[PDB]
Amino acid sequence: TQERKNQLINEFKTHESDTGSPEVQIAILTDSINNLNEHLRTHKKDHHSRRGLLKMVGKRRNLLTYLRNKDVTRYRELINKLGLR
Amino acid sequence: AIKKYKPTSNGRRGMTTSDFAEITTDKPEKSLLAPLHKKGGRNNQGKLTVRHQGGGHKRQYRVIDFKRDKDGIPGRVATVEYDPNRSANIALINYADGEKRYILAPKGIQVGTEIMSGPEADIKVGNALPLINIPVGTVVHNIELKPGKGGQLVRSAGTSAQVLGKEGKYVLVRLNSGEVRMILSACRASIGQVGNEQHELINIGKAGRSRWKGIRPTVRGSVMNPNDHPHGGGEGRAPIGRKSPMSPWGKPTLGFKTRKKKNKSDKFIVRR
Amino acid sequence: KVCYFTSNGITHIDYKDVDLLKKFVSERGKILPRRVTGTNAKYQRKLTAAIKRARQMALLPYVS
Amino acid sequence: IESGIAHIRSTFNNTIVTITDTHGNAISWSSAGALGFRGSRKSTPFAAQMAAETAAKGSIEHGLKTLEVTVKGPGSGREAAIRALQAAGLEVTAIRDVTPVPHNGCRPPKRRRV
Amino acid sequence: KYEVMYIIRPNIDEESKKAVIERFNNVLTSNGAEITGTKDWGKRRLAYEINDFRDGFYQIVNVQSDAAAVQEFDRLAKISDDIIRHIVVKEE
RNA sequence: AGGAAGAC
RNA sequence: GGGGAACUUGAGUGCAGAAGAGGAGAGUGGAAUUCCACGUGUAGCGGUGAAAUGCGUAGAGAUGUGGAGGAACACCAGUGGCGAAGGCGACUCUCUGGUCUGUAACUGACGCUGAGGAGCGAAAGCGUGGGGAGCGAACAGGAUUAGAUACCCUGGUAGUCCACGCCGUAAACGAUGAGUGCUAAGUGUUAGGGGGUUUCCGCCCCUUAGUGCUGCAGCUAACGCAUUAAGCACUCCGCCUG
């Protein structure tokens, strides 16, 4: 329990000790959306979990467009690494 | 898993069919095939006894294990494939001896799983156990009347029985049509609901597709002559003129209980 | 007006304490209310979870 | 036959009594309807008092002398029934308030003023 | 962390009693879940009537698992004809 | 918690 | 406003904790109601303001047993909890959504609102397949009344329950849109954190985040609201014009 979070944190870690820095957060929520999306594929008719899923999709999209506005190069290398469109 | 056809002609206007998703191959085993010919309701004299039969697309019988005599030997479910003789579809399993057998595929069985048929076998879907070993309440199909004869009771698609508790030498079993009935506890009955489950929810479509299964036209007696049916005759659109609506032969047909009253199996039946 | 659990400073119910649950249950088999027993609300929720577990495992009676 | 159960039941409308053995063996029974009242007098504890009286006569007729009594249903003939049973030449040892209490079970029938 | 309580019926001779508790301990340990402890209370008089038994044997098995052995134990326990009761508890 | 009772 | 470069409060992340009837699936348990079989057992049971229809000498009701099946989870239970709203109360497990407290280790304005759009959405209703114990529109018998297509009594179909879809409405209510910030107090309750002789019981003082009840200035046409504003402001939305 909670080792995948650690390995994505020090993998997408760009500063030495950062846990903010939105590449870390986009990585964490891409893993969380994929896990919860498999859960809803099992339980199709759960709806409050879908509401949580839509909330995290909104969080990730707002962080992504902020990263577009700040630096397009880091955003481009992140989207090429993660593979989402 | 019911594939509706979009209406392009008036024949396909209300037709549905199965998707045949669970069927994995289209070539049955050449060592477990036996020939058949239609008889059309005919007899050993040659006369017609069964109305409304004969004329369908030809088929070939797959010999299917109803006895489950192989005790102590684990098998592997090689394929699940289409049998035209029965509403369920069957599974070819390879035993560890080297031979292959055809069983009825239960609900939720998958390719490659193991099948253990002994009286010491644990309860999973597809295993065959005697009814003194099968615990109370489990869904059970392929029940035998007599020990060693072969599974007779609940064999069609999507139908399964329940075990309402053991009694001794006998075992109480609730069959389909809600029917509680006592079966000797040496009868080997398989475990699990039968695995097509969707044979009811099929709209046939044309008249031709009911013909392809070997079903002839069915004629009311109201449109027949007086000497061909009790209902026949009348100066146009006759009602059932007689009291007690009748068979074409001389017996009434609505509500008339046709089971023999002095039947020898009445001591083994509880409810109906 | 005093809680036993906050009085003695005890950790969680340790649900196999059949005598303790038998003392907190009424003699008919009813769970005693908070206004009578005097426990805190968190410990009342933990107590009623323990008591229902014991009732299912047939350690404490339902009716008498 | 010395000891028994007195199953007294008191509804809002009726009061019915059975003298029974401990092992499920009824001796005799009576009610206000058995004693002849047809109207609202069935609900009166006085009619319950005669019902308990003639139940005690049937109990003495078979021959038992000691009881314990179980009461069912909400009613009014509680004290009159138990005092008639104890003062009719019998003994009572225990009182049981056995009323069937569902947890919820099935839903109750509808109200009287809809 | 699962503490497991199960009730065995008292019409059991003690040879087959240790046979069936060894059987269920083997069920717990055959799926990669080692046991962390056990405790046998013995025979106690139950609070109400199960089938015909006023009393029965209580066993407690403390397992650390990957949450397959507990429900494998559960299906084998309520499919058995000789164990009266069973619950599992995830300790917090 | 203890009756059905219209219109001007 | 457009651009470049700083900063940490707004907003997120990590770390350490806490509570929950938040959701979906599978399983298990007891008390009741009904039905069936048997033992005892006589002559009534039920029902209302009197009544009667009903059920019952083919043995009822009561009573002691043993099976069947469905629904709902008493006390715990609290102007308590959780959820965006509808709503969610037996217990256990698998998966899962959030919320709150503390920290100061991070990124450094990533924020608010939101027309159209998409998604949920009580009950009743519809389609397909199950299940049907109790309750019960429709419907029938008994009363009452001038009539009584109603209240009241006896039955009782669809429904209520499960799975898959649909419709998309309620007095869907706090008859109070969302967000942020200032403005006297008193007193309970829920989940925390910190301090004063303790790691003992409790006693006091700060401290949030709910959830109540009284009560100033102030607002209102009055009722009333009042740090959970209907006060003083700023943004965005929806809506009204007898």
Swiss-Prot record, chain A:
Q: What does this protein do?
A: One of the primary rRNA binding proteins, it binds directly to 16S rRNA where it helps nucleate assembly of the platform of the 30S subunit by binding and bridging several RNA helices of the 16S rRNA. Forms an intersubunit bridge (bridge B4) with the 23S rRNA of the 50S subunit in the ribosome.
Biological process GO terms, please?
Answer: translation
Q: How does it assemble?
A: Part of the 30S ribosomal subunit. Forms a bridge to the 50S subunit in the 70S ribosome, contacting the 23S rRNA.
Its cellular-component GO annotations read:
cytosolic small ribosomal subunit
Disulfide linkages recorded for this protein, renumbered to the chain, are none
Gene3D superfamilies, per database record:
6.10.250.3130, S15/NS1, RNA-binding
Q: Which GO terms describe its molecular function?
A: rRNA binding; structural constituent of ribosome
Keyword hit for Cell cycle: no
Keywords recorded for this protein, A-Z: Ribonucleoprotein, Ribosomal protein, RNA-binding, rRNA-binding
Q: Where is the composition biased (Basic and acidic residues)?
A: 1-18
Q: Which protein are we looking at?
A: Small ribosomal subunit protein uS15
Q: List the PANTHER family.
A: RIBOSOMAL PROTEIN S15, BACTERIAL AND ORGANELLAR, SMALL RIBOSOMAL SUBUNIT PROTEIN US15M
Identify the PROSITE patterns for this entry: RIBOSOMAL_S15 (PS00362)
From Swiss-Prot, chain C:
This chain's function reads: Binds as a heterodimer with protein bS6 to the central domain of the 16S rRNA, where it helps stabilize the platform of the 30S subunit.
Q: What induces it, per record?
A: Strongly expressed during exponential growth, decreases 2-4-fold in stationary phase, part of the rpsF-ssbA-rpsR operon. The operon is induced by DNA damage by mitomycin C.
- Recorded name of the encoding gene: rpsR
Gene Ontology MF terms in the entry: small ribosomal subunit rRNA binding; structural constituent of ribosome
Q: Specify whether Ribosomal protein is a keyword of the entry.
A: yes
For this entry, the protein name equals Small ribosomal subunit protein bS18
Asked whether the keyword Nuclease is assigned, the reply is no
**Lineage top rank: taxon:** Bacteria
GO cellular component assignments: cytosolic small ribosomal subunit
Whole-protein residues included: 14 to 77 of 79
Which residues are connected by disulfide bridges in this protein? none
UniProtKB/Swiss-Prot annotation, chain D:
Which GO annotations describe the biological process of this protein?
A: translation
Q: Name one GO cellular component term.
A: cytosolic small ribosomal subunit
Q: Which GO terms describe its molecular function?
A: rRNA binding; structural constituent of ribosome
Q: Name one Pfam family in it.
A: Ribosomal_S11
What Gene3D superfamilies does the record point to? Ribosomal protein S11 (3.30.420.80)
The reply on keyword Magnesium is: no
Task: Write down the PROSITE patterns for this protein, in alphabetical order.
Answer: RIBOSOMAL_S11 (PS00054)
Q: What keywords were assigned to this record?
A: Ribonucleoprotein, Ribosomal protein, RNA-binding, rRNA-binding
Q: Does the keyword rRNA-binding apply?
A: yes
| Annotated family | Belongs to the universal ribosomal protein uS11 family.
Quaternary context: Part of the 30S ribosomal subunit. Interacts with proteins S7 and S18. Binds to IF-3. Interacts with VmlR. Interacts with BrxC.
Role: Located on the platform of the 30S subunit, it bridges several disparate RNA helices of the 16S rRNA. Forms part of the Shine-Dalgarno cleft in the 70S ribosome.
Descriptive protein name:
Small ribosomal subunit protein uS11
Q: What is the lineage of its organism?
A: Bacteria, Bacillati, Bacillota, Bacilli, Bacillales
Curated annotation (Swiss-Prot), chain E:
Which stretches are transmembrane?
A: none
| Single GO MF annotation | small ribosomal subunit rRNA binding
Gene3D superfamilies per the UniProt record, alphabetical: 3.30.70.60
Q: Which domain of life is it from?
A: Bacteria
**Record's GO cellular component terms:** cytoplasm; ribonucleoprotein complex; ribosome
Would the keyword Translocase be found if you checked this record's keyword annotation?
no
Q: Which residues form the signal peptide?
A: none
The record's annotation in InterPro entries points to:
Ribosomal_bS6, Ribosomal_bS6_CS, Ribosomal_bS6_sf, Ribosomal_S6_plastid/chlpt, Transl_elong_EF1B/ribsomal_bS6
Tell me what turns on expression of this protein: Strongly expressed during exponential growth, decreases 2-4-fold in stationary phase, part of the rpsF-ssbA-rpsR operon. The operon is induced by DNA damage by mitomycin C.
The UniProt entry's sequence similarity note says:
Belongs to the bacterial ribosomal protein bS6 family.
Designated name of the protein = Small ribosomal subunit protein bS6
Gene transcribed to yield this protein: rpsF
